[PDB]
Design a binder for this molecule. Sequence first.
Ligand SMILES: CCCCCCCCOCCOCCOCCOCCO
Ligand SMILES: CCCCCCCCOCCOCCOCCOCCO
Length: 322
Amino acid sequence: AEILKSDAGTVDFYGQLRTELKFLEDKDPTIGSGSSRAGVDANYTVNDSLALQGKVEFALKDMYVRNHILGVKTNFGKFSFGKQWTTSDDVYGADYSYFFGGTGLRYGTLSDALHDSQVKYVYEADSFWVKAGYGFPEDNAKQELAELYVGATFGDLAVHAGGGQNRDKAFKVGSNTVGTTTTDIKADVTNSYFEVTGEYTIGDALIGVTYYNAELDVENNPLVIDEDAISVAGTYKVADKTKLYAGYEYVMQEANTGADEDGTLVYLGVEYKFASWARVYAEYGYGDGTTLGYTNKGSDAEVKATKVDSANNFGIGARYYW
Ligand SMILES: CCCCCCCCOCCOCCOCCOCCO
Ligand SMILES: CCCCCCCCOCCOCCOCCOCCO
């Protein structure tokens, strides 16, 4: 990106402007959900064995801090402190969409993929890696979080596995009205999760599969909910500038009361790159059934718990990068 400074030190000014139109079943078109941002990333190498990083990223709305990081890289790994995305969000899984996928990735149900005071660790060797994180609860003002993932690449097959636990002692589930007493439903909820992923590259094709489990339990309550999830997705480079993509996502939710639900999400889309600094995309999404909540990494959208009936959805977008 825009190198302001460069030597043993570099200062990089970077960002994205986005314009996105969303057409959701039974709604008027929405313009302006596009997640634009701008930041600065400063790096300095002290020697062969030690480097420092300072990064800050703001949303372009009014303006507010998205990430704010101090980093220390050493021969025994990299340690990063401050307001960061979760390690679970960085590793992600087999969702290749720009708008509607991610329903089978179950790490974000409570956290929305962010904790304002974390320490994150990364170790890399050859093709092999370890990534971990911990969130400081601040005498209960912030959630509890602890995560660990490992992965490697063996020829054309890349694999990873891991997970964690995320606790929110006062999570807002929703609201109830009984006569004229309207009241918030809040609970002490823990989300415990684990996943395995494989991604296979063959020529112009990429195919991925992710399995996820999660367990939601409530501290002073017999209620437990288990989720079992599969995501099957791929991409295909049909020309130098042009990539097609598609996925199928199925999730079953089972409560210890015996209540069962499930949800299906299918997407198909196309990406076109004008240049390294410009691209556009268009996507169709078909949803049926239930989600307890998910995050689409591509667009940064959060979808709260919901049920839909045979819903047809479309998105179109364009981005500028520097
Ligand atoms: C006991 C925990 C061990 C988990 C580590 C990885 C297990 C092997 O992973 C291979 C990656 O598989 C991705 C998931 O689905 C593969 C099943 O489908 C095979 C046909 O595509
Ligand atoms: C490892 C590659 C898997 C191939 C895709 C199938 C995944 C389907 O999940 C099994 C659980 O299904 C229960 C409901 O299935 C409804 C009809 O499914 C259409 C098959 O894609």
